[PDB]
């Protein structure tokens, strides 16, 4: 596990939605390569339990603040307590995405497709306005979205969902390239099934969702992953070692095949 | 120019947006092929003309209603003047599109943003469902987007819009796999630049800018399109020639490359 | 059905490997929209009966030869059989491919491996080259690759196959972008499972198989694909009406998911 | 700089082609995340001053062998050479490649072309072959093919070299498919332009031929690639921070788009 990676000391890093599952991960593994870490979410409990974990592991440079990703106000508070608390920003991780619709495509209402593309979509190109100019005062940065494989293989149940991801897949391309001239690389990641909470409906139930699931995917590697698997890839997209990559998505599925 | 091909005897066609432009050489195409056709646009002078200009022609199976396109009164006066006109719907061409912004990325406001999309990508689910259960009655269909070849290669100036495209590619599948049930094959097209109002901005002023973006671009074939190299593709698309083609995007940009 | 269309009179074919299934039917629906086409396998018996099944339903613009499609002097065979029979070449179909191999990439021997590509890849750029010279003195026309969606999907027992069509999507991309300056657009096609002799093993066990089949093949719209299901889309990639249309691959499988 | 990562401890890893450029920076960096390495290249000379660079950073785990990459005897000879000297092998990174060509793709003779695939595909099929036993005896382990960004846009001049790096792409996702049962992780590097030997046409003319090729070939980041650019993602691509990645390819080139 432990990588003695110390590639982030001095940075500062945001992780939307960081109190469970895959930000939470991303966030300690900045916060053991040296980074400053500020991590959201909607509910005090999860960032004070989140903060607790944490601090617990000898992990303190972090800090975090409770709101909703895509309220405006909320955004902007966010942006501001990090520049408090750490003086400046370098690195963005835009791990939020609300997933509340499951039937057919034909029965989203219009009301949740704009609302699945406002927290999925928007809120992340808000977040990187807001943060773009404090990025770029540093000389340059990351900016990571966490996309799906779902952008790529529409799935059943969640098609509305699949399709903002495959917008993520855009808009990450969209920002890379505008934001190259700031030395700032925005890539993505689009992971499989991920053993979290948002999830947990698929999977559950031990082997039997966890060992067909497997294979009616059709994961090679014969496993669902886990949150710590998205990790050590965003790292490795905030740091140096990507430093000539951007506009990439990097798909974290065990083997699933949905494009060359 | 002329196939001979008769492919849409007996067959109704809604073209949005389809006054000028690709749409309205989409609509003459099927209109040659023996297609029924209702066009719409926002402008009763564009209806009128595009109207008389088909009907000059000999392409008299064509009726025309005026209305902005993503409003939801206008979409069911579409759809239910279809009805009324021919009496059953069997193809969906999404053509609508709206391309009003110029400028970086970062420039781009939140309303502009969510007009984009609105505009770009809500419009064409609208329509999707509200033709969806006529088509299906028919015993099944097609449903065509246009999307864009800025759909994979993200442009500058209009990125925003390119995005949306982007989405239309992932909204194109998702409908294939949710409308397979009813025999409704949903593919798109993604055109290069072509030669419309839309891009007149670009190419304006002969070759040289005609000539220069020509490769600029990286255009293999030496031109920039004109509007009926789209229609032979939607054509096809939405025939039997395609009986086995579902959830597919066409690139339609002279040989430049953005994906495998 | 019948389409009407007659978008080749006056036009010269060459379709390899084309006595039975995807090939054949390639040949007959050039031959019903006006073409001159001459076919080839490797058994003079399958030609003989082939140009006679076509012969019977009217379609008599038609020659054949007997040759291996990887001989080079076949491959001269063949070419200079069409010039002395029709005068000139305005498209070549690249339907040949072989897959002797069942069972895991790692058992493929060096020796397999090089046969495989050699047919199904190198036979494609002698026969490109032996054409060309012919193909641009009509001022341009038409190259079409057939290669496979397993060139997107890996499949399992196949994988090498895979390769080789993999393959066969860069080929046919390098040559479109090599040859526009001729206006020779390079296209190719990318079938599922198409229900012929190749495939039989995957399909064979009743409509119950296949219907099992179509749902761990995961496709969409439920049903195995037949030879002319790829007809349609070669003659539309090899006609005016893909005229600003080069280097792109067209999956024809029905609704299965490999790619953006 | 450093990264201070050690996640090769008691690993070994076997970099063909590694004297130089990309294959010497991987190796560097692998050795000091604490590998043990063996690299081999034709030139015993090359061999002698790459072991004698490294050794005098105090990188000193490694060991040499010359040796032609396509010749089976050579290739039998380096496998069994990291066996003498380390007794196992855990990473096989098949950077190897070569391209003699440089012209219009129509005239690469069919011995070309038959090399370019022998030295650029089936070597590292059969370098695979030869390591897969002893790396699955480990428990698992990576394979890394160096592929290139040509393989997803075809390039001018070494159009046939591209061919078969999109033949890597399919050899990398049918591998990592048929290893998955293993454990063994197989994803590819796909670079743009690195300055290197190899690529020294191209962007040979001084620090603004360098800037004039930037812009020609559409880098977002504005600089051309430098082999250090590859070593960070083929040592995260081996390490356990990509544990549940397989079948990927990852673009390395500042920012050209050619795949969604
Ligand atoms: N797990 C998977 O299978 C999977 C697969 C592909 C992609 N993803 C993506 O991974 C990301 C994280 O998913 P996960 O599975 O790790 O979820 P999770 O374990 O349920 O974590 C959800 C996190 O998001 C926070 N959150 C939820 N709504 C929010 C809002 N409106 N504003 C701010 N924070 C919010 C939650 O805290 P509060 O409740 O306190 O707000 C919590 O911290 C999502 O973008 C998802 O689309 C997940
Ligand atoms: N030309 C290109 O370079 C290019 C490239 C890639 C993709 N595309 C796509 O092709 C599609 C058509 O573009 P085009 O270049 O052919 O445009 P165009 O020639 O300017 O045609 C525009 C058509 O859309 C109608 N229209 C505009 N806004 C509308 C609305 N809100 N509701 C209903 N109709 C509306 C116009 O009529 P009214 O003014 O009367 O409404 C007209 O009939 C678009 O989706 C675009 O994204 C174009
Ligand atoms: N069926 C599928 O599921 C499927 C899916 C994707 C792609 N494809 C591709 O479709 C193409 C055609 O295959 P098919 O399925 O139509 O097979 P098929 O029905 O078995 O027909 C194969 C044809 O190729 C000829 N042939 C075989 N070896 C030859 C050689 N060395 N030289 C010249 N002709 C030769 C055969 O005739 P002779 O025996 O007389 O030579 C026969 O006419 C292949 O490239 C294949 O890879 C097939
Ligand atoms: N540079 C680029 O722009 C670029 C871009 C994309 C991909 N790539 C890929 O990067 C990989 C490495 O190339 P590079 O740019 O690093 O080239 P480089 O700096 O010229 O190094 C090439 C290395 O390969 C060795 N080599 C050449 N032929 C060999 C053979 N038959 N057997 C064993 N070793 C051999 C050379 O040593 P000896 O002379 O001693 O054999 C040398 O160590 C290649 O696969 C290339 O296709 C390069
Ligand atoms: O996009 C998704 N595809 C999935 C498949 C399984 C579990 C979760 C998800 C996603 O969030
Ligand atoms: O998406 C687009 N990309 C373009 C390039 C040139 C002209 C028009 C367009 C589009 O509409
Ligand atoms: O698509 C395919 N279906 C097949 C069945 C058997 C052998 C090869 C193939 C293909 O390439
Ligand atoms: O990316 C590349 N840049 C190059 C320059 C010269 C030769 C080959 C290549 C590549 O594959």
């Given at each position: 596990?432990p990588?003695?990676?110390?590639?982030?000391?001095g940075?500062?890093?945001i992780?939307?939605?960081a109190?469970?599952?895959?930000?939470?991960?991303?966030?300690?593994?900045?916060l053991?390569?040296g980074?400053?870490?500020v991590?959201?979410?909607?509910?005090?409990?999860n960032?004070?339990?989140?903060?607790?974990?944490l601090?617990?592991?000898?992990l303190?440079?972090?800090?975090?603040i409770?709101?909703?990703?895509?309220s405006?106000?909320?955004?902007?508070?966010?942006?501001d307590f990090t520049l408090?608390k750490?003086?400046?920003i370098n690195?963005?991780?835009?791990?939020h995405?609300?997933?509340?619709?499951?039937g057919?495509?034909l029965?989203?209402?219009d009301?949740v497709?704009?609302?699945?593309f406002?927290?999925?979509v928007?809120?992340?190109?808000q977040?990187?306005?807001?943060?773009?100019?404090?990025?770029?005062?540093?000389?340059g940065?990351?900016?990571?979205?966490?996309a799906?494989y779902?952008?790529?293989?529409?799935p059943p149940?969640?098609?509305?969902?699949?399709?903002?991801k495959?917008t993520?897949?855009g808009?990450?391309?969209?920002?890379?390239?505008?934001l190259?001239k700031?030395?700032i690389?925005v890539?993505?990641?689009?992971?499989?099934?991920?053993?979290?909470?948002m999830?947990?409906?698929?999977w559950?139930?031990?082997?039997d969702?966890?060992?067909?699931?497997?294979?009616?995917?059709?994961?090679?590697?014969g496993?669902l992953?886990?949150?710590?698997?998205c990790?050590?890839?965003?790292?490795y997209?905030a740091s140096?070692?990507?430093?000539?990559?951007?506009?990439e998505?990097?798909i974290?599925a065990?083997?699933?095949?949905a494009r060359?």
């Amino acid at each position: 596990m432990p990588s003695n990676c110390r590639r982030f000391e001095g940075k500062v890093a945001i992780v939307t939605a960081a109190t469970k599952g895959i930000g939470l991960a991303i966030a300690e593994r900045l916060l053991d390569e040296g980074a400053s870490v500020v991590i959201g979410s909607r509910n005090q409990k999860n960032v004070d339990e989140a903060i607790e974990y944490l601090k617990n592991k000898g992990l303190t440079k972090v800090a975090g603040i409770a709101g909703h990703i895509a309220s405006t106000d909320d955004q902007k508070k966010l942006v501001d307590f990090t520049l408090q608390k750490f003086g400046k920003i370098n690195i963005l991780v835009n791990n939020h995405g609300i997933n509340p619709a499951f039937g057919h495509i034909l029965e989203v209402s219009d009301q949740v497709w704009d609302k699945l593309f406002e927290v999925n979509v928007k809120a992340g190109f808000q977040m990187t306005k807001l943060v773009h100019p404090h990025i770029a005062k540093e000389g340059g940065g990351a900016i990571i979205f966490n996309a799906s494989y779902s952008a790529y293989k529409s799935p059943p149940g969640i098609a509305a969902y699949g399709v903002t991801k495959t917008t993520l897949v855009g808009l990450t391309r969209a920002l890379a390239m505008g934001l190259a001239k700031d030395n700032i690389r925005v890539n993505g990641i689009a992971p499989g099934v991920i053993k979290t909470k948002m999830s947990q409906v698929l999977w559950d139930g031990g082997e039997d969702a966890e060992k067909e699931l497997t294979d009616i995917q059709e994961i090679a590697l014969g496993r669902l992953g886990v949150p710590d698997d998205c990790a050590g890839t965003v790292a490795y997209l905030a740091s140096d070692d990507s430093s000539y990559i951007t506009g990439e998505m990097i798909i974290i599925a065990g083997g699933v095949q949905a494009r060359l």
